[PDB]
Amino acid sequence: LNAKVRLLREELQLLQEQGSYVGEVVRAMDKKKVLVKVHPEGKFVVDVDKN
Amino acid sequence: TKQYEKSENDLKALQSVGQIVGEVLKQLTEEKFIVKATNGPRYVVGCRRQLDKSKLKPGTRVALDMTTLTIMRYLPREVDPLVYNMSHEDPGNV
Amino acid sequence: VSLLSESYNPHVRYGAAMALGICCAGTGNKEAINLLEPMTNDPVNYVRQGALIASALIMIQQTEITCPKVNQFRQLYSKVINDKHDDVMAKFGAILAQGILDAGGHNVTISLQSRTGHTHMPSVVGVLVFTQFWFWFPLSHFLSLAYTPTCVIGLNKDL
Amino acid sequence: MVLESTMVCVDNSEYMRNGDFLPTRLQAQQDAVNIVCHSKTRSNPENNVGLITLANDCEVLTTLTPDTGRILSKLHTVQPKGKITFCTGIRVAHLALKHRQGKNHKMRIIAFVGSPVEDNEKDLVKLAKRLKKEKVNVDIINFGEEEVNTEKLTAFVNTLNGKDGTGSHLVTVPPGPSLADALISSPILAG
Amino acid sequence: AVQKVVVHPLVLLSVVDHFNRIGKVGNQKRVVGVLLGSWQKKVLDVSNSFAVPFDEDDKDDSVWFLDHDYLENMYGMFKKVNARERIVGWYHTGPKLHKNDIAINELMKRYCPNSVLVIIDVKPKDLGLPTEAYISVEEVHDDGTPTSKTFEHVTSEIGAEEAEEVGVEHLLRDIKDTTVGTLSQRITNQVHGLKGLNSKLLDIRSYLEKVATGKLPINHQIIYQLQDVFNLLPDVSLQEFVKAFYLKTNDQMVVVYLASLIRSVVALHNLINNKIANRDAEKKEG
Amino acid sequence: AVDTAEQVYISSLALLKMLKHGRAGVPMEVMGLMLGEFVDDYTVRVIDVFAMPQSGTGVSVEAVDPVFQAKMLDMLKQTGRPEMVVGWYHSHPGFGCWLSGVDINTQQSFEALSERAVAVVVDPIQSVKGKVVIDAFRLINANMMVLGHEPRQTTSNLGHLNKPSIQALIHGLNRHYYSITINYRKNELEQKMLLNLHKKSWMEGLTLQDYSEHCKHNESVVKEMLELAKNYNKAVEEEDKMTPEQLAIKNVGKQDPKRHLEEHVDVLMTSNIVQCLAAMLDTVVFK
Amino acid sequence: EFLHAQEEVKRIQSIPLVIGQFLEAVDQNTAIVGSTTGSNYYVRILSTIDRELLKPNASVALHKHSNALV
Ligand SMILES: [Zn+2]
């Protein structure tokens, strides 16, 4: 329980500058990359993601 | 000769950046004011002691800090085309 | 001390690694090593350093055939010091630990307990002043008194 | 210039309301305060001079300060009615002189006594031996009416200092009509 | 008039640390300074203050003198940096005031219409909530004697706003906080009897002492009147206090029943979920 | 020439004035001045903190008034402690306390008069209460950029100070600046009373007054407040009695929550406060 | 120290904040939340209160940069 309040600190640090986005895959690519379209933004294409 | 130095001293006061406009939506507490920028984003901030809390009111045009994003000065109303709607001129009368 | 090594603050975790370091250095206990494995993995900087020196005292004069973690650790000492991303603090005790294992050309070790049953005071005094090496850097030289020779001397008599 | 801090004591006792001094002791001693404050101004700029009332309950109207505007402001409408108090009138000046910023400035006190005092000889001898230890030098100028050819105060000044101390000078006014500005002529020329 | 006052730990500390200023140079007497208050309502509040050099001669044991020019300059600086702050009165560290302190108020009464003097204590000992607050008023008397000025007690409380609570709570690092519901009410429950006793016991020893020594007055007038008021309450049954018994217990009736109501529910969720998570989780591992 | 680890000793009186002067200036950044004594290069202490008057131009190198300093120093010379000033501090209310181009402009002015002149930043906002908060900075020499910039000795406090890092803006000051450690000192006597002052604040004056007023409360409207608790115990429990049945539907504790769940702990704690303050009746009212 | 840790989770970020619209919680410990900037963000939920104030749709106040639910 003392470790969870510390975990919130580090996790805050990773989500502080950019947090994390919400993507929408329009198509997947042969190079392991994945065409992703964000609602406010333009379309991207991004890769593995080993998990 | 000295009037110039008066102007240059005015520049020293111009080293203070213009504040950012906004509106007052509500206020959650005295240190939590629910505000919105004229550009769309909404915020909750406290403020300094130079305000009168009752004078704030919802739906109020205010100016915010560039960092704290909080009210320092405020103005009631502004409109650009109005004075131009009042600037019409016509002779007569006669 | 297994449960104190899990404490929330790394200060008690540091003292807790040091306890196992200085007390078990005259022994080849593997349980102490097992509790000092996760200590170098803590995200805190200096606690990892503590694990380096403690693990250096458990392996004095003990080769790989003693405990299987000797080479495991010896690659870690050089790995942490050749990586620029790591903290300078943590990589201080790395080369320092390489000095512990290699002290005297591997020929000497530290012994707080003679076989006679009495404690060796230059050993104890040296190491206890060596506890805090940050506060005074020349205090790291008092550890040289803790080094004792391990040898078989077959001198018959006189010269 | 010599470094010191002078403390003036204006006489508001009920015996100063008479017009024996021309035109009245209030304006007579007021002009005395003007000449001494301008004298300290011409001496050194660092020397500061406050005032203290001796009659009734002693109160410091103006704390020690180098400007005389406040002093001249308090000389007016002072309402000079009460009984003179002497034994505490030197000690108050010493009290404001222990709070002084400068330790180089010597402790100096001037006071005007225009009324008889009920202080016993033993009290004044105790304060004399005390001011010797505190080294404080007090220059008194006697005004008004008192015991003819004032004795207790004269011997007080002589026994307060010694060797030399050149020193504390007590100038007693002779019983005759004269302008006050002419009475301050002898003390302002030499102590 | 004034009801209660609020003194912050910041200004209080500002008295104590000045006691360290004159502590090394000594010697006698006590720290005397002028208090800066903030008045937002009938309730009084203190924020900051400033010390003033003060010395009391002994001859002359009733002689008191303050620095007026220094007062002007320092109060002008604090009025410059803070427009809301102003002098509400003065303060001294006591520990007990002297008869001479009556005129000290009369001096600065030209600065403030009503100047409240606040005693404080630099060395905490006894008997409870620290400091003190006095207001200067004239109640005359039924005797027709000339008007006597006696200071009246004003209840004081320690408080703060926001930032001043931060440092105060941060620097302690000593005792649990609070904790409400368990150790906040019981500790103060013993505090009620303890601080009630010692207050009553020191003062009740005073009452027995006042007639032997300390006469006059002492007693009279204020003593006998409050004496009979103390004899106004015995105070128990007969009668109706007998009838409060079973309704107090009856207020405990539903409370014990609600207690036992949720006690079984706690045991419910805990035992059910844990025994399942015990044996059913262990059976898959081995 | 000699660079070592540094340490700041703060006084209980100092921090309290810091956060106050900073609170009154929000949002606008204020200008304070640090007061204390230089004992050596590797240690420093701040024994006092005094506030400067605000100006319409704001924080600037010219914001320090020399005549104001000589006056204030008059008031401090006649005080028991006439110690020389040491450095300056300024509040940074709305951000993460990074030194700006205005702060550096007054750093080189203090480094010529004072050898160290520790730069301190204090903000009430970034911390609720129990944080150590504040901050501290030091200007490294920019003309040394050709030689080794990498001390110190006794790197312990250096390691704990540079951590956590903690975002980016904080790291943007590693160059041209380096922080300096802060540690409290006691002064435990006055600290002991300072605890008991706030704690006793909740307690009563006579201590028999507000507890007996809570005894007047012990029957108010407390039978009605116990009817408030009775409605929470009916309304929360008849919907928390469907939960043991719903656990069989979802099988078993998968998310969830509802809620409407628990909350009886606070009800029992308030009822326990009621019964204890009510148990004081038989103690107080009787004798 | 645990009661002292509660102040560590309340400490960040205190004031000020930026409003957004809560969308939904993808699971325990992290959620997706629409910002007033008009962007949905995968964002952690504060370890203190994850539950009763969540609701399907509600205006939620977030830190400026971290967009962290409080
Ligand atoms: Zn700045």
Side-chain angles (χ1 to χ4, degrees):
Chain A
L1 266 64
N2 205 161
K4 295 178 56 64
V5 296
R6 305 297 196 173
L7 193 144
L8 204 151
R9 299 269 309 171
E10 190 64 21
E11 191 66 19
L12 178 78
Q13 311 306 293
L14 279 52
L15 187 130
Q16 182 63 264
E17 259 249 33
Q18 176 176 77
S20 297
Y21 295 148
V22 183
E24 302 287 336
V25 52
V26 285
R27 196 173 176 174
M29 280 303 109
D30 56 340
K31 52 187 62 181
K32 302 179 296 178
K33 290 189 66 69
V34 167
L35 292 168
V36 175
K37 179 183 182 65
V38 197
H39 311 289
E41 317 299 325
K43 295 186 186 66
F44 289 175
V45 56
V46 82
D47 197 85
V48 153
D49 286 329
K50 61 178 184 299
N51 297 333
Chain B
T1 302
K2 306 176 163 185
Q3 309 179 341
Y4 295 97
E5 184 61 30
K6 195 173 173 182
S7 44
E8 307 294 334
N9 295 340
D10 301 343
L11 192 128
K12 293 292 186 307
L14 294 177
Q15 307 297 142
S16 154
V17 271
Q19 297 193 322
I20 168 67
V21 298
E23 301 93 351
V24 177
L25 307 175
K26 266 203 186 74
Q27 63 175 33
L28 204 153
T29 319
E30 294 302 329
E31 294 180 345
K32 295 171 194 179
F33 295 166
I34 304 129
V35 292
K36 191 183 55 177
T38 61
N39 297 132
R42 302 184 180 164
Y43 298 95
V44 281
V45 299
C47 287
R48 49 188 308 178
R49 315 155 175 77
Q50 80 174 20
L51 53 74
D52 296 336
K53 50 180 181 301
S54 297
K55 180 177 45 52
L56 291 168
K57 303 291 199 303
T60 303
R61 193 192 312 277
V62 291
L64 307 177
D65 189 19
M66 292 309 187
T67 300
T68 320
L69 308 174
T70 188
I71 288 97
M72 177 182 293
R73 294 163 298 110
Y74 52 90
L75 73 100
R77 296 296 301 179
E78 63 175 354
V79 49
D80 191 2
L82 175 66
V83 190
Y84 305 147
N85 298 129
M86 313 291 292
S87 307
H88 164 76
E89 188 276 339
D90 172 80
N93 306 131
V94 188
Chain C
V1 200
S2 185
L3 182 65
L4 289 173
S5 63
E6 300 295 332
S7 50
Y8 71 99
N9 45 13
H11 293 72
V12 187
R13 291 197 296 254
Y14 197 93
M18 283 199 68
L20 280 70
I22 59 187
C23 169
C24 288
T27 63
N29 198 329
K30 181 177 179 79
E31 186 176 354
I33 311 179
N34 205 341
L35 311 169
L36 300 169
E37 191 61 27
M39 293 298 298
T40 176
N41 207 21
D42 204 38
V44 186
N45 53 350
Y46 62 99
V47 63
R48 299 186 314 256
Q49 184 166 14
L52 308 176
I53 285 96
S55 190
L57 297 173
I58 190 72
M59 295 181 313
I60 56 193
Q61 292 192 334
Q62 302 178 175
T63 61
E64 173 75 7
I65 199 171
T66 63
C67 54
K69 300 295 182 291
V70 166
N71 296 339
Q72 311 269 340
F73 291 148
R74 286 172 55 95
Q75 44 189 25
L76 200 144
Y77 295 121
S78 315
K79 182 62 169 182
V80 288
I81 194 173
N82 295 141
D83 184 21
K84 186 178 176 181
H85 300 278
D86 297 336
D87 291 349
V88 188
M89 176 177 298
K91 71 175 64 177
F92 180 81
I95 183 58
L96 199 142
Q98 292 292 280
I100 307 296
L101 170 57
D102 297 336
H106 310 82
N107 308 318
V108 305
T109 182
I110 63 108
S111 64
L112 277 70
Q113 189 69 93
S114 46
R115 187 193 179 85
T116 62
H118 183 56
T119 177
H120 204 46
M121 35 179 81
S123 207
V124 183
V125 174
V127 70
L128 66 89
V129 189
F130 180 79
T131 52
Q132 304 287 309
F133 51 91
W134 306 280
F135 300 151
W136 198 253
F137 292 161
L139 285 187
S140 57
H141 301 280
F142 282 163
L143 189 59
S144 64
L145 300 181
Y147 298 139
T148 60
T150 42
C151 53
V152 280
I153 303 163
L155 185 70
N156 49 24
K157 194 175 56 63
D158 57 69
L159 198 133
Chain D
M1 295 292 164
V2 56
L3 297 177
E4 74 274 355
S5 299
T6 310
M7 193 74 182
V8 71
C9 198
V10 295
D11 201 337
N12 46 329
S13 55
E14 65 170 351
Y15 290 148
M16 301 296 285
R17 291 178 301 104
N18 54 345
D20 60 335
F21 285 155
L22 274 74
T24 316
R25 297 186 182 176
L26 285 62
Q27 186 177 346
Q29 76 173 6
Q30 189 170 358
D31 303 341
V33 179
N34 296 94
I35 66 107
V36 301
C37 70
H38 295 69
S39 175
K40 301 302 179 177
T41 306
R42 302 293 184 266
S43 189
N44 206 37
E46 306 180 348
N47 301 339
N48 42 359
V49 172
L51 69 94
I52 173 57
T53 169
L54 47 84
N56 196 23
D57 188 19
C58 299
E59 285 171 9
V60 172
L61 292 77
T62 69
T63 319
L64 210 70
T65 173
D67 184 29
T68 180
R70 203 176 289 102
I71 292 90
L72 315 188
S73 76
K74 301 291 187 298
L75 304 174
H76 297 234
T77 185
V78 75
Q79 187 60 31
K81 187 180 67 61
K83 183 64 181 171
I84 175 186
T85 317
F86 180 87
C87 175
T88 204
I90 301 99
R91 185 68 64 177
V92 52
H94 183 274
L95 183 67
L97 274 34
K98 299 190 288 293
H99 298 167
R100 286 178 304 103
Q101 47 174 14
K103 302 175 295 301
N104 288 256
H105 294 354
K106 247 51 197 186
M107 289 174 288
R108 181 183 304 267
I109 309 167
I110 49 177
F112 298 155
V113 178
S115 302
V117 64
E118 302 173 350
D119 187 79
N120 199 338
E121 54 187 349
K122 297 193 76 73
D123 303 338
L124 75 86
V125 80
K126 294 189 296 294
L127 304 184
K129 78 167 59 53
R130 187 58 169 174
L131 297 176
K132 290 181 178 299
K133 309 289 279 288
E134 306 162 352
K135 200 175 59 184
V136 182
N137 294 128
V138 182
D139 302 337
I140 307 97
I141 299 174
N142 285 335
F143 284 156
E145 73 274 3
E146 204 175 353
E147 182 75 16
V148 51
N149 301 122
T150 62
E151 193 275 340
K152 301 180 296 301
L153 278 64
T154 311
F156 180 82
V157 187
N158 199 338
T159 60
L160 195 149
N161 54 257
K163 195 58 59 169
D164 291 72
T166 182
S168 287
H169 304 87
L170 172 59
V171 182
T172 58
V173 47
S178 199
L179 306 167
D181 305 337
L183 266 62
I184 55 94
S185 180
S186 178
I188 199 178
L189 183 58
Chain E
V2 189
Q3 181 179 356
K4 58 179 176 300
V5 297
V6 183
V7 173
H8 300 171
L10 274 57
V11 51
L12 205 148
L13 212 160
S14 173
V15 197
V16 188
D17 56 36
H18 193 249
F19 192 76
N20 185 34
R21 308 295 184 99
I22 65 106
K24 55 178 184 172
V25 79
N27 287 49
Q28 197 58 39
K29 197 190 54 73
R30 69 177 53 88
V31 172
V32 176
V34 174
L35 198 76
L36 280 160
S38 180
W39 188 284
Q40 194 67 43
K41 195 58 160 186
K42 178 172 61 63
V43 60
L44 191 152
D45 184 21
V46 191
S47 301
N48 198 335
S49 285
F50 63 96
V52 55
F54 174 73
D55 290 323
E56 164 262 347
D57 305 324
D58 56 9
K59 296 295 178 297
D60 295 26
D61 62 336
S62 314
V63 164
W64 55 276
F65 282 100
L66 279 177
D67 202 329
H68 309 83
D69 189 19
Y70 163 66
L71 197 141
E72 299 290 340
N73 300 127
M74 200 165 196
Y75 178 82
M77 302 187 162
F78 288 155
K79 175 63 171 178
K80 177 163 63 186
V81 61
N82 194 334
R84 193 70 65 180
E85 197 75 7
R86 55 180 176 270
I87 42 82
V88 85
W90 65 287
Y91 63 86
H92 58 293
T93 186
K96 297 295 188 297
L97 57 84
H98 49 291
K99 188 176 187 177
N100 191 34
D101 287 331
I102 179 177
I104 281 81
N105 197 334
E106 311 308 308
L107 179 130
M108 63 190 65
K109 280 178 65 66
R110 54 185 184 175
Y111 296 94
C112 202
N114 46 333
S115 299
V116 49
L117 66 84
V118 172
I119 316 187
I120 64 109
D121 185 18
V122 290
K123 296 173 309 292
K125 290 184 293 304
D126 277 329
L127 200 45
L129 189 146
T131 75
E132 216 276 347
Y134 273 133
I135 187 60
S136 174
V137 291
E138 299 80 359
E139 72 287 349
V140 195
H141 199 266
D142 194 26
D143 193 19
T145 56
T147 299
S148 184
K149 187 184 308 295
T150 303
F151 302 98
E152 290 303 321
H153 183 55
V154 184
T155 172
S156 178
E157 52 182 352
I158 301 308
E161 191 257 341
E162 284 305 319
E164 33 199 339
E165 285 181 346
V166 183
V168 172
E169 269 160 62
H170 171 56
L171 295 182
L172 58 101
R173 310 303 299 116
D174 189 22
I175 204 59
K176 306 175 188 294
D177 54 334
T178 303
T179 63
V180 180
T182 169
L183 56 97
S184 173
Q185 71 278 359
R186 54 154 310 178
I187 274 77
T188 57
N189 281 342
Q190 295 178 354
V191 174
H192 101 281
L194 196 151
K195 267 71 183 177
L197 285 188
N198 47 37
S199 180
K200 184 62 173 175
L201 185 150
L202 277 57
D203 304 331
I204 201 180
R205 195 59 56 181
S206 74
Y207 308 150
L208 175 64
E209 189 268 343
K210 292 293 179 297
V211 185
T213 57
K215 200 79 173 300
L216 293 165
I218 170 61
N219 201 336
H220 312 94
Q221 195 271 294
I222 192 63
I223 296 292
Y224 77 96
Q225 200 180 339
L226 196 140
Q227 158 194 2
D228 212 343
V229 181
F230 175 81
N231 213 347
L232 251 69
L233 52 100
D235 44 348
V236 282
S237 74
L238 251 60
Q239 168 62 264
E240 296 78 5
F241 188 74
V242 178
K243 276 60 179 182
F245 282 165
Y246 78 95
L247 180 144
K248 165 55 179 61
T249 301
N250 206 337
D251 293 336
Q252 190 57 251
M253 195 79 167
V254 188
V255 172
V256 169
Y257 285 157
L258 290 169
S260 59
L261 285 58
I262 288 92
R263 299 273 193 281
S264 69
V265 178
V266 187
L268 191 146
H269 296 72
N270 295 335
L271 295 174
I272 274 69
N273 302 271
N274 196 327
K275 292 177 181 290
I276 295 170
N278 189 24
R279 60 177 183 92
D280 300 329
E282 188 269 346
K283 61 182 299 181
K284 304 299 297 180
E285 181 180 358
Chain F
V2 46
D3 283 343
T4 324
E6 294 91 5
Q7 192 59 68
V8 174
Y9 299 145
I10 75 100
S11 43
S12 180
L13 68 103
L15 190 125
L16 295 192
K17 307 301 176 179
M18 309 288 284
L19 44 71
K20 191 174 65 175
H21 190 71
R23 185 60 173 175
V26 174
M28 190 173 177
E29 61 275 0
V30 298
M31 178 55 67
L33 291 179
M34 182 183 51
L35 184 57
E37 190 264 355
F38 285 164
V39 52
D40 43 54
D41 178 35
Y42 43 82
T43 50
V44 68
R45 63 150 50 181
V46 52
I47 200 171
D48 186 16
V49 162
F50 58 100
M52 281 295 292
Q54 295 79 8
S55 300
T57 309
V59 166
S60 61
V61 56
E62 298 91 10
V64 179
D65 203 9
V67 305
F68 189 81
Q69 289 299 102
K71 213 162 176 52
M72 185 66 179
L73 286 191
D74 200 335
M75 309 158 163
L76 295 171
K77 285 177 188 176
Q78 53 169 39
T79 319
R81 276 171 20 199
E83 67 286 1
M84 197 58 197
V85 301
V86 281
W88 64 281
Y89 73 87
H90 65 286
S91 289
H92 273 178
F95 46 91
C97 72
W98 69 285
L99 305 175
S100 50
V102 181
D103 299 333
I104 194 184
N105 280 284
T106 167
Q107 284 288 156
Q108 76 255 346
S109 293
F110 277 85
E111 70 181 350
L113 184 58
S114 175
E115 168 180 9
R116 299 160 188 93
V118 181
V120 187
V121 190
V122 57
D123 161 269
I125 281 81
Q126 303 282 343
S127 60
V128 53
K129 45 178 175 184
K131 194 185 182 177
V132 292
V133 197
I134 202 170
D135 202 26
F137 286 114
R138 190 51 176 87
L139 168 58
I140 197 58
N141 299 332
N143 304 132
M144 289 184 69
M145 60 180 309
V146 188
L147 202 64
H149 278 76
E150 288 89 0
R152 315 282 172 276
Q153 297 66 27
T154 78
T155 324
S156 269
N157 60 343
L158 281 310
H160 307 156
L161 177 69
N162 186 27
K163 289 301 179 183
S165 171
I166 213 81
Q167 293 313 128
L169 172 140
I170 292 295
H171 99 286
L173 312 185
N174 178 29
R175 74 168 213 194
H176 286 207
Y177 289 117
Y178 67 95
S179 187
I180 171 181
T181 52
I182 305 99
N183 70 335
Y184 303 94
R185 66 179 144 84
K186 266 74 182 180
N187 288 128
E188 190 276 344
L189 184 143
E190 192 274 333
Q191 189 56 235
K192 176 187 74 58
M193 71 166 297
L194 187 143
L195 172 144
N196 184 28
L197 268 40
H198 194 278
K199 296 300 172 182
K200 188 70 175 182
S201 182
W202 303 82
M203 202 52 184
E204 333 170 9
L206 203 139
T207 66
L208 280 71
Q209 295 184 338
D210 301 333
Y211 262 138
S212 62
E213 287 179 355
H214 285 81
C215 297
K216 303 171 177 180
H217 284 90
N218 275 342
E219 296 175 5
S220 288
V221 193
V222 152
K223 293 172 298 302
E224 283 74 0
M225 97 164 308
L226 296 176
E227 293 173 339
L228 301 176
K230 92 184 182 171
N231 299 331
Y232 298 146
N233 293 324
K234 297 163 178 62
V236 180
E237 276 175 3
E238 102 280 349
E239 66 186 346
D240 282 343
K241 78 182 184 75
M242 298 286 100
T243 41
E245 299 174 357
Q246 292 179 334
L247 288 179
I249 277 79
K250 40 181 174 300
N251 287 330
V252 53
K254 69 173 170 203
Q255 56 278 1
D256 279 327
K258 303 295 295 178
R259 93 155 181 94
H260 31 286
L261 180 57
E262 46 192 281
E263 272 157 308
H264 313 265
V265 180
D266 297 338
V267 188
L268 289 186
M269 296 297 307
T270 52
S271 193
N272 286 337
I273 298 184
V274 162
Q275 64 185 350
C276 75
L277 292 185
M280 311 310 286
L281 284 160
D282 296 341
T283 53
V284 172
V285 177
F286 185 75
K287 218 50 196 166
Chain G
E1 300 166 348
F2 177 79
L3 304 181
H4 189 287
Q6 299 303 322
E7 309 312 312
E8 306 294 326
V9 299
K10 290 303 293 191
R11 167 212 145 153
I12 293 56
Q13 18 236 56
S14 175
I15 49 96
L17 288 80
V18 50
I19 281 81
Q21 177 207 345
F22 179 81
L23 189 51
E24 64 176 347
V26 301
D27 61 343
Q28 182 55 250
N29 293 131
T30 180
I32 53 185
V33 53
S35 60
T36 309
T37 67
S39 305
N40 289 333
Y41 294 134
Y42 186 64
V43 162
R44 297 292 308 272
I45 69 186
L46 209 162
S47 175
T48 56
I49 289 87
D50 293 330
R51 295 174 174 88
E52 75 283 6
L53 56 75
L54 183 135
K55 295 317 174 174
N57 289 331
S59 185
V60 55
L62 312 177
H63 180 254
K64 179 56 179 61
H65 309 289
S66 78
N67 305 327
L69 309 167
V70 169

